[PDB]
């Protein structure tokens, strides 16, 4: 039947029970396309959704929009139409001096900086992806050739006070977030994005399988710009590592 | 000079120091042909930008997404660029028995049911409309014909367990948010959304004019599902009454 | 039917649903003598109640104390008696350093640095003021010809530490409050005070009206001990001010 | 030289480092006129201060009003003015089957269900008497012939939902003290009042001795009433047992 | 029926009604020996259990272990076998410089820096001792001949970053416990130690009687080993004193 | 290697050159798993802290007891971390919740609801109670090898035995409001059991550059109202620690 917000039905879907979920609805037909039979569903607000075939078996990808509150709408609605696995891709930014561009990380948990995680969880249970879903991503990422690196992601509400930015209008961040980024970064936290912490909640405590992969694009620490060819790698690698994790996931 | 989400520069604003923010993409282009001269700016992920002219000034239209992270990036950025004043229009549900399918609310005060509100200040700071804005709303609404009701507003990080929905995939309802409903319903709340706890709390403490206007399409206590033709007078009245508030903060 | 600490009965307040609500016992004389026939009605602990009439309708006076816990029995104990509309009128030190001693503040919502919010609503609850109750002690105030200043409200449980001060008996303020004011300050909040936070949030979750307006008697970027002798014209133009706002709250 | 709400200077104290500290102004000469030479001091608001003489040594009797917030002024200022010792005597409400009206409570520590406690210290500090003063005050109420009981006390913002009354304007209780009397029994509480939380923690974490010991005045599981006579026994018993707790702590 | 961990039955305990309930195992026998007819009863992980008689009525021994978790099983424990009255015993290091080597400690109420005394009250309610326990704790350390402090300690679920202690393997402390020292110092707090907030909590809000007290043997502000090991050998005298005063 | 740690009483050089480290909760348990592993010597007991060193596959490994709970853990992984261990592998028992585990199972904790104390220690509550990929990696190959069911998800990590795994079969017979219901709530958010000390655990290594992970042994099943056997809890913990030693020799490779 047709859910709220992504203007789909169960039949639409032809029985896909795995969805790779990236922010941008633009991204969403490209990832399609790197599978078979790609088709147009439907697209409303931030909610861009395709099918597709991956050997033989049906496949959703559908945009989630920035931060939690979006994402949690799109995965409560595709769970309703029988999707059971989450498989988030994105490009980040990273925190840690080891952590290079081009390189890929793997979620193993993430910071809860964010306000729908405690929508289903409190904030003492931990926000940490499927085992099988982390495996399937970590043998994609590394089977590209890439360096890969496993460990834990900061997910923030925000993309500028949360992420301890002070190049904004106010130059100011409040108490919670002042020396954040330090503490993160000495805790060995590799990253920081927006959807992680709610999304891996979520699914961590309704029975859904989840997890995080991400290229990194540009480093924190670092003062040199990556050239644009770098850029179009990773985004292009980052996409074709979700569909081999995919691939792994499939029965 | 390029904001990086937003996709615009201050000179592409023509001055504007207004923006009137709906969540939808697809309600920007119709809220700027309400004024003169509107001309498409940018459209990147859930981002639409336009320009327009209300009694000879520039004016700002934005969407917003859906949530107060993608909402907290659009106002920095806009705010960056030198828009002081941020009008928020949207459609709502009510959970007030005497609230009708047509009526308009002005939320005075929101409960801070979000995370990105805590990105700017602690939970203590009310999450409250600059006060010249919640006047010009209130005028605009009374002067469009509608019923307006001035009261506070419950504002969710979540579209389901948030607003205590039980018909979805769980159909569970974490302990935190469990008899909510009915609690905010006591505490005389009128409506659920899930925008202005993050927008009211980050202007206020950001020296930022702020305030939101919604129409009602829903009532979660009235069985009568309302007519087809209530539904879109109700869009329709909404942004006519955000522009004529816009137009009272200019004068 | 006698409340148990004010020490009157419904008929005593001979069919008054509105309050004017002063922190000082020895203040309640002189705001019902403003007014016309004022009575004594009774005085226990720090409760003076008066009654007397304005344009013809009977009005109560009552002092509260000091603080959100003797506020809280007062208003319980009046809409006991069936008072629903409460205005708060007493002294406060800005903050804003271009807020002057003898400017007058109406609050638009306050920062809950209290305990007794607490026991009506959760902190994420906004301690917010009755939109009406707001407009008129705005209209009161400008038309007083006093310089008037709308916004947040810091509302302290505590003189001293809750507002940092410095000069005291330890000279020590916890971790929680160092560097609080800095903080409030650049969150453009204008004022301290100590009953706001308990009265609108009591009021705004139990279906009764209230407000608060306040005469500035120190300004803390330059001081912290108010001197007694600008405070005796801010006080007396803050009961004529709340005098007339209750003139424009009656039907 | 003179305290600002209190209105009196070191010189007026005649070398007094030990205050007593009732909650009601009437209350103060009552108290004082049981010691030698008793002087009225200065009544401002709910702060009636006496001088008296215990011994050849100097005491103060000073009003807190209800509530921590006013209670935290009285305190502070003494304090400036050289008071060390801080004793508490009022009334409450019993919560126990065992403990009778006219039985008299020395609180060992206090559940802290204020505010004005977390301006000192934060909620892990522990709402505690001074040893002394607590040993002072049983030997003192035993040596009336009271029936006398050593325990925790819980200490509330408000006067009805955080003791759990339902007898009130809303008959609302708020989720947080929603079942928390049979709570606080089942824990072993004896009682509820109004300023033990805030005066145990601002003194115990400021290098200041306090304690104290109340009267019970009601029975929260008894539907009898109260005899007049035992009653009026019951408060003078109180002052003079505070009187002789005083006794015992100066040399 | 016997216990999960303790390893005892209430019939072991000869009626015992107060345990005296030290950190480490291994002063457990040293203090049941302090008392007439010392018996031992069991040992298993970190609880080692005596009985003994003290004024002709049954005592238990029992060790905690480190932490409240360890303590909360073996206080709930002994509960269910009949012990009411529970006294706990132990060295400690001081803050307040005027506190000196030798002293005791005893304590008036604990800050909560724990996790198992939420598991019984919110953290709003105090950790608080036992006024009689508490009152025989200062009665027997003033009778020993010991200098005595009644006050505060500040009870901590680690003992290294939640004691500000930055020796460590990595030198950080979480920014909870950053300045934490110094503002328990300003606060008049005497000492930290690592059981008293989930002991006295539980007990308070349990219809249990409990107290704590210690010997100082050192001062993170500022000792003889002759006179350390005499602040230790007072410090069990003085326990099982207060015992004695406990038994009606 | 010449300073001796404060509560373990003993020295980097007494360790040999270890980096890994297996933490049983039990100080007995501490010479049965050394005992599977070559060369094991006793180095030291003090309080609830025995230490022993071993060698696997030519490499020194410490075995370590912690004690029970997040505290006397804290102690035995800082001291052990002074001294150069840099890889924590905790083994132990625990209570299943969900009724599909059945009493003799593995599971392997990939991340823990975070119900103590010590954790908060080392990082705010946001910060995930998680393990180490490559352990807990290691663990499950390791347990699976054993023939063992071997199950992987979140673990309830509690400060207590009593009220925090919601026991009301206790003196009180009382729950406080915090944790009423809280295990039906655990189990319908998919956690699989309760046990002491890896909230504690995973907290400080995950926030302080050690890599850390855990493995239990079901012994009881909350669902299931059987008085535990003797010969199959004898039997869980034998296999228990093969398993942690076999996770330990994946590690050293
Ligand atoms: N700097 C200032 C000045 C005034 N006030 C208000 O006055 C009363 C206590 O002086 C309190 O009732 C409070 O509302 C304050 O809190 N802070
Ligand atoms: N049942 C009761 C009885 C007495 N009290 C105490 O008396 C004052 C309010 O009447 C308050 O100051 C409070 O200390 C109370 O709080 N609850
Ligand atoms: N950035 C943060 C640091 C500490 N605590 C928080 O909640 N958030
Ligand atoms: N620095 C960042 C890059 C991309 N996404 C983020 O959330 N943050
Ligand atoms: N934080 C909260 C959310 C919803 N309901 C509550 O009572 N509290
Ligand atoms: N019921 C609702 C209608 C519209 N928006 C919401 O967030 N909720
Ligand atoms: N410094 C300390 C000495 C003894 N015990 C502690 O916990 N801390
Ligand atoms: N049920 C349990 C068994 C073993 N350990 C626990 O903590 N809990
Ligand atoms: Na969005
Ligand atoms: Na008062
Ligand atoms: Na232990």
């Given at each position: 039947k047709t859910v709220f917000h992504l203007g789909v039905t169960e039949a639409d879907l032809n029985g896909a029970t795995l969805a790779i979920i990236p922010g941008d609805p633009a991204r969403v037909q490209?990832?399609?396309?790197?599978?078979?039979?790609?088709?147009?569903?439907?697209?409303?607000?931030?909610?861009?959704?395709?099918?597709?075939?991956?050997?033989?078996?049906?496949?959703?990808?559908?945009?989630?929009?920035?931060?939690?509150?979006?994402?949690?709408?799109?995965?409560?609605?595709?769970?309703?139409?029988?999707?059971?696995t989450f498989l988030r891709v994105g490009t980040t930014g990273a925190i840690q001096?080891?952590?290079?561009?081009?390189?890929?990380?793997?979620?193993?948990?993430?910071?809860?900086?964010?306000?729908?995680s405690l929508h289903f969880?409190?904030?003492?249970?931990?926000?940490?992806?499927?085992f099988d879903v982390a495996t399937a991503m970590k043998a994609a990422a590394q089977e590209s050739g890439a360096t890969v690196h496993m460990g834990v992601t900061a997910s923030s509400d925000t993309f500028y006070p949360g992420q301890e930015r002070?190049?904004?209008?106010?130059?100011?961040?409040?108490?919670?977030?002042?020396?954040?980024?330090?503490?993160?970064?000495?805790m060995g936290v590799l990253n920081f994005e927006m959807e992680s912490a709610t999304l891996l909640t979520m699914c961590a405590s309704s029975g859904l399988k989840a997890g995080c992969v991400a290229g990194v694009i540009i480093?924190?620490?670092?003062?040199?710009?990556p050239d644009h060819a770098?850029?179009?790698?990773?985004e292009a690698r980052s996409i074709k590592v979700v569909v081999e994790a995919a691939r792994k996931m499939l029965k």
């Amino acid at each position: 039947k047709t859910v709220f917000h992504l203007g789909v039905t169960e039949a639409d879907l032809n029985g896909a029970t795995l969805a790779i979920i990236p922010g941008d609805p633009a991204r969403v037909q490209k990832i399609a396309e790197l599978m078979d039979n790609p088709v147009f569903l439907a697209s409303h607000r931030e909610y861009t959704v395709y099918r597709a075939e991956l050997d033989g078996q049906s496949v959703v990808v559908c945009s989630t929009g920035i931060g939690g509150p979006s994402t949690s709408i799109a995965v409560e609605e595709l769970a309703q139409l029988g999707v059971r696995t989450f498989l988030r891709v994105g490009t980040t930014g990273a925190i840690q001096p080891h952590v290079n561009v081009g390189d890929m990380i793997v979620t193993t948990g993430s910071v809860r900086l964010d306000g729908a995680s405690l929508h289903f969880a409190p904030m003492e249970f931990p926000a940490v992806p499927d085992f099988d879903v982390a495996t399937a991503m970590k043998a994609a990422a590394q089977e590209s050739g890439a360096t890969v690196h496993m460990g834990v992601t900061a997910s923030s509400d925000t993309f500028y006070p949360g992420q301890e930015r002070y190049d904004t209008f106010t130059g100011r961040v409040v108490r919670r977030f002042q020396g954040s980024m330090k503490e993160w970064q000495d805790m060995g936290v590799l990253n920081f994005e927006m959807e992680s912490a709610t999304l891996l909640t979520m699914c961590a405590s309704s029975g859904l399988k989840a997890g995080c992969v991400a290229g990194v694009i540009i480093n924190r620490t670092q003062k040199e710009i990556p050239d644009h060819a770098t850029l179009k790698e990773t985004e292009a690698r980052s996409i074709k590592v979700v569909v081999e994790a995919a691939r792994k996931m499939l029965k």
